[PDB]
Design an enzyme around this catalytic site. Structure first.
Site, PDB file in Angstrom:
ATOM      1  N   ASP A 140      -6.743   5.862  -0.998  1.00 44.84           N
ATOM      2  CA  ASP A 140      -5.693   4.948  -0.548  1.00 44.84           C
ATOM      3  C   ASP A 140      -4.595   4.728  -1.581  1.00 44.84           C
ATOM      4  OD1 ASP A 140      -4.321   3.291   1.175  1.00 44.84           O
ATOM      5  OD2 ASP A 140      -5.709   1.599   1.026  1.00 44.84           O
TER       6      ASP A 140
ATOM      7  N   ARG B 277       1.397  -0.345  -2.284  1.00 47.87           N
ATOM      8  CA  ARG B 277       0.736  -1.630  -2.062  1.00 47.87           C
ATOM      9  C   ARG B 277      -0.549  -1.781  -2.879  1.00 47.87           C
ATOM     10  NH1 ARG B 277      -2.988   0.722   1.924  1.00 47.87           N
ATOM     11  NH2 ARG B 277      -1.759   2.475   2.745  1.00 47.87           N
ATOM     12  N   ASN B 278      -1.105  -0.666  -3.340  1.00 46.03           N
ATOM     13  CA  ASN B 278      -2.354  -0.702  -4.096  1.00 46.03           C
ATOM     14  C   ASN B 278      -2.184  -0.458  -5.593  1.00 46.03           C
ATOM     15  OD1 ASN B 278      -4.036  -1.320  -1.910  1.00 46.03           O
ATOM     16  ND2 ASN B 278      -4.110   0.840  -1.271  1.00 46.03           N
TER      17      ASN B 278
ATOM     18  N   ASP C 152      -7.200  -2.205  -6.382  1.00 49.71           N
ATOM     19  CA  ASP C 152      -8.402  -2.258  -5.555  1.00 49.71           C
ATOM     20  C   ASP C 152      -8.855  -0.921  -4.978  1.00 49.71           C
ATOM     21  OD1 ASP C 152      -7.677  -1.863  -2.576  1.00 49.71           O
ATOM     22  OD2 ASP C 152      -6.135  -3.275  -3.254  1.00 49.71           O
TER      23      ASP C 152
END
Length: 278
Positions: free
Chosen positions: A141, A145-146, A162
């Site tokens: 992912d 955003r991460n 995360d």
């Protein structure tokens, strides 16, 4: 092999103080706390599955196994008290996507951000990804955003955060992931290319005006994003290489890192002006 429980630094629940919230994570909330050490605190709901108990444990074991400057540190856990905590490196800069959108050059702030700022974030994340790849971890992912920032300011460091079907991040996924549920380090390479586009677009959603299914069909057919506004050619070249249809034709992160580093050397690249939103 994963860390063992004994590898986890259990912090006495009394040493831990929650200062304030930071939002609701996937499972449970995340808080700013202190053990004096500033930490981010991920919590497990007391009402949870035996499966969630396993998931939470396995999260700590995994992040604790990772040791790199561009990956968020796991400082410790508090699993012997309820609700259970995982303690993480605090990242005051917040997430990369929000930062890019908040910090876009505007007529009132024409120089809120330079091309070199973007190249450094890209290099930071590429460095963390190289570490994941050489240690045989697949993130699945990679996305703006991460990624998290240490601070808003000039010496900011970006780090991968995360590691936790209509949920699938299809706009960040290569076709073999899309179609076959196949994930490899070459999977993350494709995603990193989309991240590059996010970065140099200054925080736009990938494939503007296309829905998930529209992107699925677009990509399957060989469609790719055009360069972001004012994106230097060497940077766009890196993007298109991470988006080769066949994974074997996509670069590993060693090569990607070298190419980003070369971009930062090019005066013609770094002296390129970012677009100003009117």
């Amino acid at each position: 092999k994963t860390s063992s429980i004994s590898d986890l630094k259990e912090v006495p629940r009394k040493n831990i103080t929650l200062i304030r919230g930071l939002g609701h994570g996937a499972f449970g909330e995340v808080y700013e706390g202190q053990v004096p050490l500033q930490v981010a605190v991920k919590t497990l709901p007391e009402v949870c599955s035996e499966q969630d108990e396993l998931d939470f444990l396995m999260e700590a074991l995994i992040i604790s196994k990772l040791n790199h400057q561009n990956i968020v540190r796991c400082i410790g856990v508090s699993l012997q008290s309820l609700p259970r905590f995982i303690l993480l490196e605090l990242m005051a800069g917040g997430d990369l996507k929000s930062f890019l959108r908040e910090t876009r050059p505007r007529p009132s702030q024409p120089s809120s951000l330079a091309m070199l700022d973007l190249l450094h974030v890209a290099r930071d994340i590429a460095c963390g990804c190289q570490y994941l790849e050489e240690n045989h971890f697949i993130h699945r992912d990679i996305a703006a955003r991460n990624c998290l920032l240490t601070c808003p300011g000039p010496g900011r460091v970006a780090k991968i955060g995360d590691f936790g079907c209509a949920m699938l991040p299809v706009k960040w996924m290569p076709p073999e992931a899309f179609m076959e549920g196949i994930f490899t380090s070459k999977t993350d390479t494709w995603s990193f290319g989309v991240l590059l586009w996010e970065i140099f677009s200054l925080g736009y959603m990938p494939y503007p005006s296309k829905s998930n299914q529209e992107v699925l069909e677009f990509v399957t057919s060989g469609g790719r994003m055009d360069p972001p506004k004012n994106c230097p050619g060497p940077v766009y070249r890196i993007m298109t290489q991470c988006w080769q249809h066949q994974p074997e034709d996509r670069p590993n992160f060693a090569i990607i890192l070298e190419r980003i580093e070369y971009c930062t050397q090019d005066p013609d690249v770094i002296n390129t002006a970012l677009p100003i939103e009117y």
